Amino acid sequence: FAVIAVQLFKGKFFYCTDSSKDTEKECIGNYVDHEKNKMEVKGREWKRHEFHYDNIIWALLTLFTVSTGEGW
Amino acid sequence: NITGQFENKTNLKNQLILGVMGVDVSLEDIKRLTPRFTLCPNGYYFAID
Amino acid sequence: SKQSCITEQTQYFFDNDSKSFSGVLDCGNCSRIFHGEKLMNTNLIFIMVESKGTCPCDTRLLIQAEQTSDGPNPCDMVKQPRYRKG
Amino acid sequence: LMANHDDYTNQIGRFFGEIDPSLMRHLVNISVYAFNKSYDYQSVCEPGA
Amino acid sequence: LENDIKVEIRNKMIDGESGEKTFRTLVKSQDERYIDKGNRTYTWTPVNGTDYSLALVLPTYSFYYIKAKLEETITQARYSETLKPDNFEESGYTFIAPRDYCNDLKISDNNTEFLLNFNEFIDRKTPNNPSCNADLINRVLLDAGFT
Amino acid sequence: RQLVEIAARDIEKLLSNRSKALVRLALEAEKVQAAHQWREDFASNEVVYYNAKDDLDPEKNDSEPGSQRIKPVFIEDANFGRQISYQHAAVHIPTDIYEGSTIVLNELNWTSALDEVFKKNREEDPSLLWQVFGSATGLARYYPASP
Ligand SMILES: *[C@@H]1O[C@H](CO)[C@@H](O[C@@H]2O[C@H](CO)[C@@H](O[C@@H]3O[C@H](CO)[C@@H](O)[C@H](O)[C@@H]3O)[C@H](O)[C@H]2NC(C)=O)[C@H](O)[C@H]1NC(C)=O
Ligand SMILES: *[C@@H]1O[C@H](CO)[C@@H](O[C@@H]2O[C@H](CO)[C@@H](O[C@@H]3O[C@H](CO)[C@@H](O)[C@H](O)[C@@H]3O)[C@H](O)[C@H]2NC(C)=O)[C@H](O)[C@H]1NC(C)=O
Ligand SMILES: *[C@@H]1O[C@H](CO)[C@@H](O)[C@H](O)[C@H]1NC(C)=O
Ligand SMILES: *[C@@H]1O[C@H](CO)[C@@H](O)[C@H](O)[C@H]1NC(C)=O
Ligand SMILES: *[C@@H]1O[C@H](CO)[C@@H](O)[C@H](O)[C@H]1NC(C)=O
Ligand SMILES: *[C@@H]1O[C@H](CO)[C@@H](O)[C@H](O)[C@H]1NC(C)=O
Numbered sequence: 441f442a443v444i445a446v447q448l449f450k451g452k453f454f455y456c457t458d459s460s461k462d463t464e465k466e467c468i469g470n471y472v473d474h475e476k477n478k479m480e481v482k483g484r485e486w487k488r489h490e491f492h493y494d495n496i497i498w499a500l501l502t503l504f505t506v507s508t509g510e511g512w
Numbered sequence: 513n514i515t516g517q518f519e520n521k522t523n524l525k526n527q528l529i530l531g532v533m534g535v536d537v538s539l540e541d542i543k544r545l546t547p548r549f550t551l552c553p554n555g556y557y558f559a560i561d
Numbered sequence: 562s563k564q565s566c567i568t569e570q571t572q573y574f575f576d577n578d579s580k581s582f583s584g585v586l587d588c589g590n591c592s593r594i595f596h597g598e599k600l601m602n603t604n605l606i607f608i609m610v611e612s613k614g615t616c617p618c619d620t621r622l623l624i625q626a627e628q629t630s631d632g633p634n635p636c637d638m639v640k641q642p643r644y645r646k647g
Numbered sequence: 648l649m650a651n652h653d654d655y656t657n658q659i660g661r662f663f664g665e666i667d668p669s670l671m672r673h674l675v676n677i678s679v680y681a682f683n684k685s686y687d688y689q690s691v692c693e694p695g696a
Numbered sequence: 697l698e699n700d701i702k703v704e705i706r707n708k709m710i711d712g713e714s715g716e717k718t719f720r721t722l723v724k725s726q727d728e729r730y731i732d733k734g735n736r737t738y739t740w741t742p743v744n745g746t747d748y749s750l751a752l753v754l755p756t757y758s759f760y761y762i763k764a765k766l767e768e769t770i771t772q773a774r775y776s777e778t779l780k781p782d783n784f785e786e787s788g789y790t791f792i793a794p795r796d797y798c799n800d801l802k803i804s805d806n807n808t809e810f811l812l813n814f815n816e817f818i819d820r821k822t823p824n825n826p827s828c829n830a831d832l833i834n835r836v837l838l839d840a841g842f843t
Numbered sequence: 844r845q846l847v848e849i850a851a852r853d854i855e856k857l858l859s860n861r862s863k864a865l866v867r868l869a870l871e872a873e874k875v876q877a878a879h880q881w882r883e884d885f886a887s888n889e890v891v892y893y894n895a896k897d898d899l900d901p902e903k904n905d906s907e908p909g910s911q912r913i914k915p916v917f918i919e920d921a922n923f924g925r926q927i928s929y930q931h932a933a934v935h936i937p938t939d940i941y942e943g944s945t946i947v948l949n950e951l952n953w954t955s956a957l958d959e960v961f962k963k964n965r966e967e968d969p970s971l972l973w974q975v976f977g978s979a980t981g982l983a984r985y986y987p988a989s990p
C-alpha cells in the first residue's frame with residue numbers, strides 16, 4: 441500500500457502559498473494575502489504538504505499516520 | 513505591437529496593445545494661460561468637457 | 562479622519578424690491594404684530610415686531626448652514642438627465 | 648446685526664432663524680425672503696454612524 | 697447656481713459653438729452665506745482641436761480696468777518706499793496679495809514675510825526688466841500710492 | 844471676445860504640445876518594440892533599471908538576480924514638489940507581479956529608448972510633468988525618477 445501510494449501521489453503533494461499560482465516557475469515573488477482578512481503582503485513559496493507520498497520512507501510514515509487515525 | 517509588419521507573419525498576439533502612453537497636464541498649468549488679474553474679482557474663466 | 566460628503570446649503574436674500582412690509586404673525590393661538598422697513602441705500606431691514614414672552618411657536622428652526630444630506634435622488638435624474646455629448 | 652433686547656446682541660452675527668424661526672418663516676411666506684437650496688458635492692463631512 | 701439660462705449656455709458650449717449672452721443671475725457669495733442679483737456676460741468659444749470649451753464670465757462694470765503707466769523709474773520708487781513695515785502709523789496696516797509678482801518671489805502664508813521679500817525685490821527691480829511683469833507690479837504700487 | 848479666443852488658443856497650444864510629445868513617445872515605443880528579440884537568459888545580459896519601491900539607504904543586497912538596480916541621485920524640484928532625478932525613468936511593478944519573470948524583464952529591456960525619448964521630450968518643453976508608459980504587463984515607467 442505504500443508502493444501504490446507512491447505511484448499515485450508521487451510529486452503531486454505540492455502546493456503554492458499563493459493559490460493562484462500552481463507551478464514552481466510561477467511561485468516566485470510576493471503576493472497580497474487577502475485570506476487572513478487583513479490584507480498583508482506575503483511571499484510566494486512552493487511547498488509540499490507536511491505528509492507526503494513522494495518516497496517509500498515518506499509513504500510509510502504518512503500511512504502509519506492514517507493507521508493511528510490522526511489527521512487522515 | 514508592430515513586430516510583424518510588411519513581412520507579414522502569423523500575428524499571434526498582434527491584436528493587443530503594448531500599453532498606453534500618458535503625459536500629465538496640471539490644472540495650475542492651465543490657470544496660467546487664463547490670467548484673471550485684469551478682470552474684476554467677480555469675473556473668471558471656466559472650461560467644460 | 563474626515564470623508565467627502567454632499568452638503569445641502571441654503572442662502573437667503575430680499576426677494577421683493579419694496580421697502581415696507583407689515584402684518585401680524587399667526588403664531589399658535591396667539592398674535593404677533595410686526596412691521597418690516599427696509600433702510601434705503603443699504604442692505605439692511607428694520608423688523609418692528611411687538612411681541613415677546615408670548616406663547617412659543619418655535620416648533621423647528623431654520624438652520625442656514627452646511628447640513629449633511631444625501632444628494633439629489635439619482636433614480637430621478639436618470640429619467641431626464643442633463644445634456645451630454647459622447 | 649443686533650437687537651434692542653441687549654441679550655440678542657450677545658449672539659451677534661447669528662442667523663435670525665436660530666432664535667425666533669417663526670418670524671422669518673412667515674417673512675419668507677410674505678416673500679420678503681426668497682431662498683435657494685444648492686448642494687456642495689465637494690465639502691468635508693463628519694464621519695457619522 | 698443653476699438657472700434655466702445657464703442650462704441653455706451649458707448646452708450651447710457642449711455643442712462646441714461660440715456665442716455670447718448677457719443676463720441677470722443669482723451669484724452666491726464666496727463665503728456661502730449670501731446671494732446677490734448679479735449682472736453677468738457669458739462669452740465662450742470652443743478650444744480648437746479639443747473637446748473642451750472655454751468661457752469668460754464678466755460683470756458689466758468689468759469691461760474696463762486700470763493699466764498703471766509708471767515708466768519714470770522714480771515714480772515707482774516714490775510709491776514703493778511707502779509700503780515698508782516701519783511706516784505703519786502714517787499709513788495703515790497693509791497686506792500684500794500673494795500673486796506671481798515674479799519668479800524670484802516665493803509666496804508664503806506668513807504674510808509679513810511676503811511683504812518683506814516684496815520690499816527687497818522692489819529694492820533692486822530695474823535690472824529685472826526681462827524677469828518680471830510691469831503690469832502687476834505697477835498696478836500694486838499705484839494702488840499703494842492711492843491708498 | 845478677444846480674451847476668450849486668446850486664452851482658448853493658448854490652451855489649445857499647450858494641449859497640442861503635450862499631444863506631440865505623446866506622438867513622439869508612441870512612435871519610438873512601437874518602433875523599438877518592433878525591433879526587439881525575445882530572450883530567457885538575463886543573468887549575463889543584465890537589465891539595469893530603477894525600481895520605484897526601493898530603499899534610499901546604500902544597501903547593495905536590495906537587487907534581484909536577473910536585474911541590476913540603479914541607485915539614483917535625487918534633487919529637489921518645486922515644479923513637482925518631491926525628489927526628482929532627470930537622468931532616468933523609474934519603474935513601478937505591482938506587488939502582485941514578480942519583477943524577475945521573463946515578461947517583466949523583456950518589458951524592462953525594450954523600454955530604455957523610452958528613457959532617451961522622455962529626456963528629449965522634456966528638453967524641448969521644460970514645463971512637462973510626468974510622462975509615463977503604462978505597460979500591459981503591469982509596469983509603469985514614468986520619466987522623472989521619483990520614489
Ligand atoms: C508583440 O507580438 C510579438 C509577436 O507577434 C510577440 O513576440 C512573440 O512573443 C511570443 C511569446 O512571448 C514568443 O513565443 C515564445 O517563443 C519562445 C522562443 O521561441 C518560446 O520558448 C516560448 O514558448 C514562446 O513560444 C515569440 O517568439 C515572440 N516573437 C514572435 C516573432 O512571435 C511580442 O511579445 C509582443 N509584444 C509583447 C510586449 O509581448
Ligand atoms: C432660487 O431663487 C430664485 C429667486 O429669484 C427662484 O426664482 C424664482 O422662483 C419663483 C418660484 O418658482 C418664480 O415665481 C414664478 O415666476 C413665474 C414667471 O416669473 C410666474 O409666472 C409665477 O406666477 C411665479 O411667480 C420666479 O419667477 C423665479 N424668478 C426668476 C427670476 O426666475 C428660484 O426658483 C429658486 N430656486 C432655484 C432652484 O433656482
Ligand atoms: C404660506 O402659508 C400657507 C399656510 O400655511 C401655505 O399653504 C403656503 O404654501 C405658504 N406659502 C405660500 C407661497 O402661500
Ligand atoms: C444690468 O443692470 C442694469 C441696472 O442695474 C439693468 O437695467 C440691466 O437690465 C442689467 N442687465 C441685464 C442683461 O438685465
Ligand atoms: C510668520 O513669519 C514671520 C517671520 O518668520 C513672523 O514675523 C510672523 O510673526 C509669522 N506669522 C505667523 C502668523 O506665523
Ligand atoms: C477655431 O478655428 C476656426 C476655424 O478653423 C476659427 O474660425 C476660430 O476662430 C478658431 N477659434 C479660436 C479660439 O482660435
Ligand SMILES: *[C@@H]1O[C@H](CO)[C@@H](O)[C@H](O)[C@H]1NC(C)=O
Nearest residue numbers: 853856857858860967968970
Ligand atoms: C510648446 O513647445 C515649444 C517647443 O518648441 C515651446 O517653445 C512653447 O513654449 C510650448 N508652448 C506652451 C504653451 O507651453
Ligand SMILES: *[C@@H]1O[C@H](CO)[C@@H](O)[C@H](O)[C@H]1NC(C)=O
Nearest residue numbers: 875888889952953954955956
Ligand atoms: C535588450 O537587451 C540587450 C542586452 O543587454 C541590449 O543590447 C539591448 O539594447 C536591449 N534593448 C533595448 C531596446 O535597449
